[PDB]
Design a protein around this motif. Structure first.
Motif, PDB file in Angstrom:
ATOM      1  N   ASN A 257      60.304  -8.366  -3.188  1.00  0.00           N
ATOM      2  CA  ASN A 257      61.601  -7.728  -4.177  1.00  0.00           C
ATOM      3  C   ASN A 257      62.815  -8.709  -2.771  1.00  0.00           C
ATOM      4  O   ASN A 257      63.594  -9.005  -3.293  1.00  0.00           O
ATOM      5  CB  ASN A 257      62.324  -6.574  -4.718  1.00  0.00           C
ATOM      6  N   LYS A 258      62.446  -7.843  -1.404  1.00  0.00           N
ATOM      7  CA  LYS A 258      63.635  -7.711  -1.032  1.00  0.00           C
ATOM      8  C   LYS A 258      62.852  -8.867   0.570  1.00  0.00           C
ATOM      9  O   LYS A 258      63.274  -8.744   1.432  1.00  0.00           O
ATOM     10  CB  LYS A 258      63.860  -6.013  -0.496  1.00  0.00           C
ATOM     11  N   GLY A 259      62.292  -9.686   0.075  1.00  0.00           N
ATOM     12  CA  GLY A 259      61.655 -10.393   1.130  1.00  0.00           C
ATOM     13  C   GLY A 259      60.272 -10.182   2.246  1.00  0.00           C
ATOM     14  O   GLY A 259      59.836 -10.748   2.764  1.00  0.00           O
ATOM     15  N   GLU A 260      59.910  -8.594   1.424  1.00  0.00           N
ATOM     16  CA  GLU A 260      58.978  -8.874   3.188  1.00  0.00           C
ATOM     17  C   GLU A 260      57.117  -9.656   2.602  1.00  0.00           C
ATOM     18  O   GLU A 260      57.361  -9.753   0.810  1.00  0.00           O
ATOM     19  CB  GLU A 260      58.627  -7.313   2.897  1.00  0.00           C
ATOM     20  N   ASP A 261      56.602  -9.644   3.550  1.00  0.00           N
ATOM     21  CA  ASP A 261      56.079 -10.472   3.170  1.00  0.00           C
ATOM     22  C   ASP A 261      54.282  -9.362   2.249  1.00  0.00           C
ATOM     23  O   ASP A 261      54.024  -8.781   3.037  1.00  0.00           O
ATOM     24  CB  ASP A 261      54.748 -11.004   4.666  1.00  0.00           C
ATOM     25  N   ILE A 262      53.848 -10.058   1.154  1.00  0.00           N
ATOM     26  CA  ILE A 262      53.209  -9.575   0.496  1.00  0.00           C
ATOM     27  C   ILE A 262      51.615  -9.125   1.083  1.00  0.00           C
ATOM     28  O   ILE A 262      51.272  -8.266   1.768  1.00  0.00           O
ATOM     29  CB  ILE A 262      52.686 -10.606  -0.939  1.00  0.00           C
ATOM     30  N   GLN A 263      51.254 -10.591   2.223  1.00  0.00           N
ATOM     31  CA  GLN A 263      50.035 -10.035   3.905  1.00  0.00           C
ATOM     32  C   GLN A 263      50.586  -8.332   4.401  1.00  0.00           C
ATOM     33  O   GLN A 263      48.979  -7.783   4.504  1.00  0.00           O
ATOM     34  CB  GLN A 263      50.410 -11.000   4.501  1.00  0.00           C
ATOM     35  N   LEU A 264      51.285  -7.683   4.237  1.00  0.00           N
ATOM     36  CA  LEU A 264      51.279  -6.373   4.547  1.00  0.00           C
ATOM     37  C   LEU A 264      50.878  -5.289   3.517  1.00  0.00           C
ATOM     38  O   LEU A 264      50.627  -3.989   3.665  1.00  0.00           O
ATOM     39  CB  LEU A 264      52.863  -6.065   5.086  1.00  0.00           C
ATOM     40  N   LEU A 265      50.783  -5.614   2.205  1.00  0.00           N
ATOM     41  CA  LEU A 265      50.082  -5.451   1.508  1.00  0.00           C
ATOM     42  C   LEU A 265      48.766  -4.815   1.879  1.00  0.00           C
ATOM     43  O   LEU A 265      48.001  -3.305   1.526  1.00  0.00           O
ATOM     44  CB  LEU A 265      50.048  -5.836   0.193  1.00  0.00           C
ATOM     45  N   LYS A 266      47.520  -5.832   2.678  1.00  0.00           N
ATOM     46  CA  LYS A 266      46.812  -4.763   2.986  1.00  0.00           C
ATOM     47  C   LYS A 266      46.567  -3.949   3.957  1.00  0.00           C
ATOM     48  O   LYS A 266      45.924  -3.144   4.717  1.00  0.00           O
ATOM     49  CB  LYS A 266      45.864  -6.478   3.606  1.00  0.00           C
ATOM     50  N   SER A 267      47.276  -4.189   5.171  1.00  0.00           N
ATOM     51  CA  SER A 267      48.209  -3.452   6.168  1.00  0.00           C
ATOM     52  C   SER A 267      48.416  -2.145   5.718  1.00  0.00           C
ATOM     53  O   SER A 267      47.488  -0.979   5.991  1.00  0.00           O
ATOM     54  CB  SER A 267      49.217  -3.376   7.184  1.00  0.00           C
ATOM     55  N   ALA A 268      49.126  -2.270   4.242  1.00  0.00           N
ATOM     56  CA  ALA A 268      49.330  -0.909   4.047  1.00  0.00           C
ATOM     57  C   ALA A 268      48.632   0.098   3.125  1.00  0.00           C
ATOM     58  O   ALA A 268      47.790   0.957   3.231  1.00  0.00           O
ATOM     59  CB  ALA A 268      49.963  -0.905   2.450  1.00  0.00           C
ATOM     60  N   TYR A 269      47.194  -0.750   2.839  1.00  0.00           N
ATOM     61  CA  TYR A 269      45.783  -0.414   1.686  1.00  0.00           C
ATOM     62  C   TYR A 269      45.004  -0.436   3.058  1.00  0.00           C
ATOM     63  O   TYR A 269      44.332   1.095   2.979  1.00  0.00           O
ATOM     64  CB  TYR A 269      45.021  -1.000   1.070  1.00  0.00           C
ATOM     65  N   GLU A 270      45.146  -0.840   4.181  1.00  0.00           N
ATOM     66  CA  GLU A 270      44.303   0.240   5.121  1.00  0.00           C
ATOM     67  C   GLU A 270      44.172   1.170   5.585  1.00  0.00           C
ATOM     68  O   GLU A 270      43.410   1.988   6.325  1.00  0.00           O
ATOM     69  CB  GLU A 270      44.697  -1.329   6.430  1.00  0.00           C
TER      70      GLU A 270
END
Ligand SMILES: Nc1ncnc2c1ncn2[C@@H]1O[C@@H]2COP(=O)(O)O[C@H]2[C@H]1O
Length: 166
Positions: free
Chosen positions: A98-111
């Motif tokens: 919602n503040k424009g952070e890239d959804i791709q980082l959701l993979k990094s988060a789950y890693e």
């Protein structure tokens, strides 16, 4: 790690309609995941609930962690005490789309989950961070290889997740 009443979605992902705080109290897991922000300010959502259940002990520890190490990166994590909820709490920062952070980082988060053999966790970025929760589950399934027990508080969402996953 006495998980009960979970539905096995994949070889390593399990899901339950439950409050993660109550699950943590009853399961006493090795690791509970907090859906955190980068300054570890646990003022609402899952983080506020977990912190409240520790009667602000998590917040005081988190403040000291930040003062020494600085803020986390989006997609990053730190391991701190689980206090009465777990042996450890893995604080993980998903993107705030919602503040424009890239959804791709959701993979990094789950890693980050893969550093732990068994985890009790919420879906990441699905609260105020605004990611679609069904998408978040899909990234979880595609990214986490260790054994993850997902607690989904809202039965309406739980039913959609199970239906989408079949
Ligand atoms: N005031 C707050 N309101 C909502 N969520 C909060 C608040 N403070 C911290 N959080 C946490 O920040 C997390 C960001 O990712 P999520 O939206 O998945 O879940 C969120 C909560 O766990």
């Amino acid at each position: 790690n006495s998980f009960s009443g979970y539905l096995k979605l994949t070889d390593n992902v399990y899901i339950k309609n439950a409050d993660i705080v109550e699950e943590a109290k009853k399961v006493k897991p090795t690791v509970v995941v907090n859906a955190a922000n980068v300054y570890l300010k646990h003022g609402g959502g899952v983080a506020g609930a977990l912190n409240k259940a520790t009667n602000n002990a998590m917040q005081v520890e988190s403040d000291d962690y930040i003062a020494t190490n600085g803020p986390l990166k989006v997609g990053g994590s730190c391991v701190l005490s689980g206090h009465n909820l777990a042996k450890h709490c893995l604080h993980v920062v998903g993107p705030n789309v919602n503040k424009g952070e890239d959804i791709q980082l959701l993979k990094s988060a789950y890693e980050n989950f893969n550093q732990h053999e068994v985890l009790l966790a919420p879906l990441l970025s699905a609260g105020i961070f605004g990611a679609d929760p069904i998408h978040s589950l899909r990234v979880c399934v595609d990214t986490v290889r260790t054994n993850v027990y997902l607690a989904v508080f809202d039965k309406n969402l739980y039913d959609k997740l199970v239906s989408s996953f079949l």
